[PDB]
Amino acid sequence: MITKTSKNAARLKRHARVRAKLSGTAERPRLNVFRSNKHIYAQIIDDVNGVTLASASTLDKDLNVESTGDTSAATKVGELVAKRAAEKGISDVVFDRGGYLYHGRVKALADAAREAGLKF
Amino acid sequence: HASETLRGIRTQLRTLESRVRDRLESMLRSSSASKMLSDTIVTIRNDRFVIPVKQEYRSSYGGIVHDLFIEPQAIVDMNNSLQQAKVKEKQEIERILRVLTEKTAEYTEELFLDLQVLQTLDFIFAKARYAKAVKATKPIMNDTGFIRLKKARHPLLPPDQVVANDIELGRDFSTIVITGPNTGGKTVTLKTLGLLTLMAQSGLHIPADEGSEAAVFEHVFADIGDEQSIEQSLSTFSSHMVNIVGILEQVNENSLVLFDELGAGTDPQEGAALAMSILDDVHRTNARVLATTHYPELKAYGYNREGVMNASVEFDIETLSPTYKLLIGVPGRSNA
Amino acid sequence: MKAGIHPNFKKATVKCACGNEFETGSVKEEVRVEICSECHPFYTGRQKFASADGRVDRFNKKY
Amino acid sequence: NRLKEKYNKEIAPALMTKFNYDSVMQVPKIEKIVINMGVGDAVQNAKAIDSAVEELTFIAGQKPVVTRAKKSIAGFRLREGMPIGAKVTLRGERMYDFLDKLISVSLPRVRDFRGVSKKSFDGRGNYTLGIKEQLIFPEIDYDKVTKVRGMDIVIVTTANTDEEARELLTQVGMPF
RNA sequence: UGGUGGCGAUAGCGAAGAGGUCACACCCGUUCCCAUACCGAACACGGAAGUUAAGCUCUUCAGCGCCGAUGGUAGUCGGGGGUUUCCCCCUGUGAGAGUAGGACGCCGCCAA
RNA sequence: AGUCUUGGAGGUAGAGCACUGAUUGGACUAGGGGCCCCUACCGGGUUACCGAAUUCAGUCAAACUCCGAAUGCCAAUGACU
Q1: What does the entry list as the binding residues for ATP (chain B)?
Q2: Domain A21-120 fold
């Protein structure tokens, strides 16, 4: 009857552990990333007002790919997020890794944002 | 549906097991009792449902310790009733098996007659599946001791390696003497006539073509032997001679006789003289005879005797190979 | 699987004196055995020798 | 393989139909098999820790851990942080191969093996042993064997009840 | 439906049902990235054979737990009195527990 | 400086068991003494001879608080003296 908690619980504990020191304010919103077994989602949020400024996902109809969970898909999602943040002139952003290690898809999305021009 | 008693016993077992599970579950969802258990779950020991229990908690319980593991007192009665239901089950099944024994005992004659009918049909149909499987024809099978194997083939050779021969015996002549050098078609012609006769006399179809005829002999006789091992060439002549003596004691007008190299393994003149005298002895019985020989003297035998026919096997001097073709009415020439 | 900290696993054909062959990933390339599962009497159901010698005493009143 | 296909094709469907589960993966599964050595005899023989570590690497390629005392004790002359026993966790093809080797050789190789303990079910659904002989199966090199103390094996399963775990083990081939 | 914040468990624990075609998770293996004092257990690497059991949602209950009155009581600033290791009166203030009751959740953003 | 007004820090009287301690009776109780039977201190039969632990109820605490006053202190905005 061995039982083990879900990965999402661990992910939330890690995300809270991270947010305990960082937060999103005006001219410096957060950049959250959520992993899914079939997708990945990114959002720009202002913790001061609890309002999202821009978001993206592998479900978007523009800049779409069939991989849906590959480094290339993450890079394209990051490029789209940076394009949205350029259209909406925030001019800055802070990275909020949702407890995930800055190794794979998260690193790819961050590098895509950096290359696009989103300065952390 | 076998009996209402069996249905009631099945209902008693399923309802009593469900009552066991519900009673265990009422113990296991009781919050005051959960402290005393190792687990809020059912377990089994010694073919009983039991509760898993903390070893230090021992004197608090009302139940039989199995191992702690405990069978509670309220379920001992249920498990005993289930045991009685298993006893009633096996009694019911033995009763129904005795009833089935009686119902089979009523239809003994029908079962035996159906078994005989199906064994007859399986025998008939297996023979016919074999007869179709070797692409073989019904022999025209006769009391006149007559054979006409049209385009006859040795059954133990492949259908593309074998050579087809017309063999006819027991009409215009009762004896055939196959003359010529020891070429592998003489003995193969003997074994072909013999095999196809035993196949045909059993109602098994023969590797010979449509309109073939074969004979209902009362007996078949063979002196067909390998010259085994040169330590024994007079054990060969003597063994052949002992077999020939045994054939001569028993042969009749209703007999087939097959002879390979009569009088071999001795002086050729004495061998040929023995062979002619043995063939004359057998020929007087009006038995059907096929003989082979390499002796020159026997090339005159079927010209000088009424009811005897000479034959030979065709040989290709250009390839140094036997053609295995039988030539009836033509004596064999030597080509040494 | 760490690099080099563990020995190389190799598929081997576990053999028995009775002829039974079993395959398991083992360090040894081959493993010779005398008593396999079926060879051991307990796995053979009611063993003949044990089922024959397990009778209770009868006081030896034969004589 | 030789065990995975057998399981998936005989134990899972049969046990599912027997227990009337509401889903396919509700069938209990053997999660892992943990092997432990337990010894603090290391107090008197510092090199004893090396023993059962070279043997465990041969039993299973997975190198064991040098577990250390989590608490000191005077009755045993122990101090926190000193090495005591060894641990191994088999998950994947390793546990299947270990089960195969065990069932095929170890149990039949024991001289007086008859009706293994039925008691040593957890209540919970796990099954637990302490082999007392250090040379149970052939990979232990009888010649190189000097000490005779066997191994703890702990079979862990997702079974919610001991009954279903017993059925799973019996169908797998545990000769109870 | 999912992600993301604020509000004091009136949010939480416990027991029973319904949901996955999407979505979220279970799941399949380690060739690739990464890794485990041992391990694809965890973290990663790609996918979708099947699974709604569990996680997660929608429902139910007052069982643990939580919030929680009014009145009165004790205590008490100030004034006064007495048999003064303490007690009593007056203006004002005013507890905890106990109850009556509430509650098995409310709103802000974004995508579908 | 005095107050009318507000918001604060705070753990004192009071009350209390929700922690740490002392403690009364009841239900139950693993375990330890005593008659002992045979008896490898192994197996029991009993005790109101004691009793860890749990549970119900009921007491006490300067250095115990799930709780918490009245008073006193700081300052501010609008006001009189």
Answers
A1: 180-187
A2: Nucleotidyltransferase; domain 5 (3.30.420)
